[PDB]
Structure formats: C-alpha cells, structure tokens
C-alpha cells in the first residue's frame, strides 16, 4: 500500500503487468482455500 502511494507507482504497476498476475493470484487463491468459518453445522451441533 505504501509503495503504491504515487500515481507513477500505479502506472508502473500497470506497465509491467502486475494486474494480470494479481488476478491470477485471485483465481488460484479463491480456487485453493476452503472456507473454515463456523457454518450452520456448528450452530446446529452447539446445542446437541
């Protein structure tokens, strides 16, 4: 965040193709990790 304060920082990020790589990171990360948050199952198991 700090190194992307200036406009030129964003411009250079776009120039050397960082956005495509981060989008790829989105695809891999979203496809990779499964949700670990306490779902409905834990709620229904809480009072048993």
């Amino acid at each position: 965040l700090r190194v992307l304060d200036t406009s030129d920082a964003l411009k250079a990020f776009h120039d050397m193709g960082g956005v495509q790589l981060i989008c790829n990171n989105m695809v891999t990360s979203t496809r990779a990790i499964v949700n670990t948050a306490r779902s409905m199952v834990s709620t229904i198991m809480k009072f048993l």
């Binding site: 709620t43 229904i44 009072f47």
Partner: protein
C-alpha cells in the same frame, strides 16, 4: 386487549432478514428477548385472570338458576368440532392419545388389531404428522 396489542406491535417491531431459521436458533446463544418475554408474560397472565373470571361468572350464572350451553339433537358432530376452541382440541387430543396408548399397552404387546394397522396407511399417517408436528406441542 391493550397488553396483547402492545405485544403485537412489539413483535411487528422486529426486523426480518431473509428467512434463515438457523440464525433464529442462533439468537438463543439481547434486550429484545427479555422485553418480548415480559410482554408475553403480561399477555398470558392477563389471559389467565380473564379465563378464571369467565369460569367464575359462568359458575355464578349457572348457580343463579341459568343453564350452560345445551347440545341440540340436530347438532352436526363436524361443525361443533369446527366451532370448538383450538385449546379444547389440543387438550382432548392429548387425552385420547393417552387412551390409545392405554389400548396399545392393553394388548400386552400382542397383535395390534389389523383394522387400525390398515387405517394407519401412508396418507393418513402423513396427514396426521403434517398437521401436528408443525403446530402441536412437543409433548
């Protein structure tokens, strides 16, 4: 009437998200619960005094020389089932299930009569659960 009405306005003052009854159960484990509890306490207690007072005035009116409601010979059993209070309905159901359990134990574990076994077919059984489990008491 005014207490139960305020209870109605209280329950109408509850914001309703998309229906996820899991969250409704999650609410057990907030001041709203206590205030609805108090309002229901007042409404149900006031119903209790109203009911005892009505029973007392009916007793007094009968003792005065009057008579209670008379069952006419032309009365259709089905409409008086329909024109009977739901509380009467639930109570008498509980009694007659007690009676049916007594008959079942009265068989001493032997063969249940085949008439009721044939009677408790799929549709009748489905209809009785469909009508009771959604609305009936847990007991």
């Amino acid at each position: 009437n005014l207490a139960c009405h305020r209870l109605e306005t209280l329950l109408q003052s509850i914001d309703l998200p998309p229906l996820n009854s899991a969250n409704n159960a999650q609410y057990f484990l907030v001041e709203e619960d206590s205030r609805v509890f108090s309002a229901y306490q007042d409404c149900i207690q006031l119903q209790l005094q109203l009911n005892l007072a009505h029973n007392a005035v009916q007793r007094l009116k009968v003792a005065l020389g009057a008579s209670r409601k008379m069952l006419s010979e032309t009365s259709n059993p089905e409409d008086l089932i329909q024109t009977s209070s739901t509380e009467q309905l639930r109570t008498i159901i509980r009694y007659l299930l007690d009676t049916l359990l007594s008959l079942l134990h009265a068989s001493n574990g032997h063969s249940v009569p085949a008439v009721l076994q044939s009677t408790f077919h799929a549709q009748a059984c489905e209809e009785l659960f469909k009508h009771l489990c959604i609305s009936g008491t847990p007991k």
